[PDB]
Design a protein around this ligand. Sequence first.
Ligand SMILES: NC(=O)NCc1cccc(-c2cccc(-c3cc4cnccc4[nH]3)c2O)c1
Lengths: 96, 254, 151
Amino acid sequence: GDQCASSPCQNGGSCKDQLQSYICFCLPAFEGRNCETHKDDQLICVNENGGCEQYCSDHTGTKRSCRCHEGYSLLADGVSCTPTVEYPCGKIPILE
Amino acid sequence: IVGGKVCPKGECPWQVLLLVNGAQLCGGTLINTIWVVSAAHCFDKIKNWRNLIAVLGEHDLSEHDGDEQSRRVAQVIIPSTYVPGTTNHDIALLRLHQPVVLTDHVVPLCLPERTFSERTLAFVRFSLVSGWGQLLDRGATALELMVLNVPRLMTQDCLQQSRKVGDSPNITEYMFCAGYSDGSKDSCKGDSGGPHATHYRGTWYLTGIVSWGQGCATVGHFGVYTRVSQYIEWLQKLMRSEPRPGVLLRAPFP
Amino acid sequence: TVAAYNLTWKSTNFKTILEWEPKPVNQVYTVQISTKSGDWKSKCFYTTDTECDLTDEIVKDVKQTYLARVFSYPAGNVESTGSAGEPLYENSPEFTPYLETNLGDERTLVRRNNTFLSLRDVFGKDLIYTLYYSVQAVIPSRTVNRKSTDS
Ligand SMILES: NC(=O)NCc1cccc(-c2cccc(-c3cc4cnccc4[nH]3)c2O)c1
C-alpha cells in the first residue's frame, strides 16, 4: 500500500501516519514494514538453529528435523536431546 | 592465558596437558576416551616421541590430587597440508595408548557437526579458551588451569581491526580470530593445542584450537584459532580408521 | 557477490528497519543483528529486499546498542562464502534505539507482556513537549534526533 490511506499494513496490523510515512503495528506473529513477514514461516536451520537444541536438518518440502549428538537421544518435542550415557560430551559433571 | 581466571577445577574437563619428557608441551582437547585434538606445531620438534604423555583431570600442576590420568600418546596425526612452523592446518589428532576413564574431571567436549558449527556455533559470540600457558606475554606460565572468554570475529572484521605487520601470517578459511585488540586478554605461549569451546543450548562444543601467530595479547591483534568445522570430517574418518604403523602420521587432508 | 553498503537505520517510535543498497542482481541477503556482547541473530533470510525490519529484536532492549550486518549470497548458491570460508557482508552503524529512534500518548512498537508501550512509558521524564512556549516532542538529553516534528 502507500501511506495509511492505502492500508499498507498487512496481516491485521494498524497504521499510524507520520510525515507522509506511516508506521505499522503488527500482530505478534508478523513483522516487516507492512506486517508482511509471517514469523511462523521461517522454521529453517539457519534461523536460530531451527529451534533444535543440537543438530538441524532442513528437508525439501517438509519440516526440518532436529537431531542429537552421539550419547544423546531426541525427545518427544522433536527439538531437545537428553543424554543416553553417563558422561555425555560437552557436559560439565560438577555443574550438573 | 592473559586476562583469564582460573578454570574452577572440573569446569574444563576436556582439557589435556601434553608433556614430553616430563616437560609441558601444549594443551589439547579430549573428544572421546582415546582421542585428543591439539595443534600440529606442538609436534614440530618432538624427537622423543615415546616420551609423549597426555594428562587429563589435571588442574594444578604443582600438587597431585586423585583426579589426574596420564596416557602415553600412541599416535599423533596432523593434516598432510600442515607445514612445520606455520599456523595453517594447525590441528593434531592424538590416539592415546589406552583410553582414559571418564569421571567428573575427565569428560570429552562434543566435536560438533560441521553445518551446525558453521551456521549456529560460529555466531555464538563468546567461547572459552584454556591452558597453563603464560599469564602475560613472556611471563610466567600458570599452575592452575586458566580459562578466558573471548569474542569471535568474522575475518572481514579481523582483518579490518588488526594492525598491518609483524610475524603475522594471513587468516585463512581454516582459522578464525577471537580475542581483544587492546592487548589485555588472549591465549599465550603454553596454551597452543588447547580448546576454544562454545556453549550452545547447554552443551559445549569444540569450535577452535589455540594456534600461534601474534605473540600473546599483542595490541592490534586477536588470537587465531584453527577453525575446527573444516576438519570434523577428517577427524571422524581418522578416528574410525585402523591404527597404521607410525607415531607421527601426516594424514591426507581434505 | 557485492556487499551491501549505505546500511541505514530508519526508526520512528521504535519501528526499526535497516535499509541498504544495492538492489540485488542475482543475489540475496540475510541480516544478522546483535548487541556488543550478544550472539548474532539472523533475519530476513535470503531476501531480495534491501530493507529488514528489526523492530522485534531492538525492542527487546531499546537501550542496548545493536549492530547489524547484511550478508550477500549469490542466488542459487546461498553457501557461497569467500576465501576465508565465510559469507560476504557489511556492517551497519550502531543503533541505540533509545537515543536514536525518531519520535512524532503515542504508542511505540515496544512491547511488554504482549502489549505495546507508549512514548512516555519508554522515555518517562526524558520526554517533554513544546507548544511555542505548536507541539513538538523533545528528549533534550539526546545528542541526535532530540525533537520530533509538529502537529
Ligand atoms: N616450531 C616449533 O618449535 N614447534 C614446537 C612447539 C611446541 C609447543 C609450543 C610451541 C610454541 C613456541 C613459541 C610460541 C608458541 C605460541 C605462541 C602463542 C601465542 N598464542 C597462543 C598460543 C601460542 N603459542 C608456541 O606454542 C612450539
